[PDB]
Design a protein around this ligand. Structure first.
Ligand code: CL
Ligand code: CL
Ligand code: MG
Ligand code: MG
Lengths: 128, 127
């Protein structure tokens, strides 16, 4: 693949959720560019490179008990970017928690996620 | 410093509220002087307070475009947020829907510095 057209952005971003949804940490990290960055949550400094991004997803996913699902359609541009709304269900002190998130991604000219920014803070964390 | 995350859920909601009711001056009053609009994302940015009016007067001048949040605003703690919504509008004279996510930053007074609107045709439907 080259720089993903808008339909290509959509399928990639939905796969990405499918991988979070099963917790294939290594297939996730192989969707990123070797020198990608992750800002998650957006505002905290960035995480550079596949090693660090791998350490980030293992800590987040390698537990407890994380599921994820789109909560509306992916919105894709014609320059290989996109944004998607989703909800992450996890376990916290045995209490089922959920977190509403939007991730923005910019891809590269091979269909690899070049930057990801995840929008959320505690206003989107609803403990039940 | 900057609006609190909770001040972001409020500003971005109010923005939606004003789109829907169609108020252009109340939209345009939300934009800091040096703001930019990228709508769609993948174009060139629009900057100039008359240019940004004008952009809201084309879209909205007909008086019948609606809009509403389709899920919660996601607000950061560095002045920014992102929201999903659905627009009702006219295209090819047929009622249509368009799904959109806007990302916004704000300033140090609660006005908009950058707006980015993500969508393309893959997000247009015909009713
Ligand atoms: Cl949605
Ligand atoms: Cl949502
Ligand atoms: Mg699944
Ligand atoms: Mg590269």
């Amino acid at each position: 693949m080259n720089l993903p057209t808008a339909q290509e952005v959509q399928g990639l971003m939905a796969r990405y959720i499918e991988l979070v949804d099963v917790g294939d940490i290594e297939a996730i990290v192989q969707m990123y560019a070797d020198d990608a960055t992750v800002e998650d949550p957006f505002g905290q400094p960035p995480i550079h490179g596949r090693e660090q991004i791998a350490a980030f997803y293992r800590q987040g996913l390698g537990g407890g008990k994380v599921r994820a699902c789109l909560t509306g359609p992916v919105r894709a541009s014609h320059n290989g970017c996109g944004a998607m709304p989703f909800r992450v269900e996890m376990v916290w002190n045995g209490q089922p928690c959920a977190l509403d998130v939007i991730d923005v991604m910019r891809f590269d000219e091979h269909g690899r996620i070049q930057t990801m920014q995840a929008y959320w803070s505690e206003v989107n964390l609803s403990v039940r």
